[PDB]
Amino acid sequence: ALVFFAEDAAIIGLMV
Known part of the structure; x- marks a missing residue:
């Protein structure tokens, strides 16, 4: 995912 x-x-990361 992106x-x-x-x-x-x-x-922070935001996973999609």
Whole structure:
């Protein structure tokens, strides 16, 4: 799958 990235503090992945 595709894993985007966002800064939630720290950077996390978002898997789709």
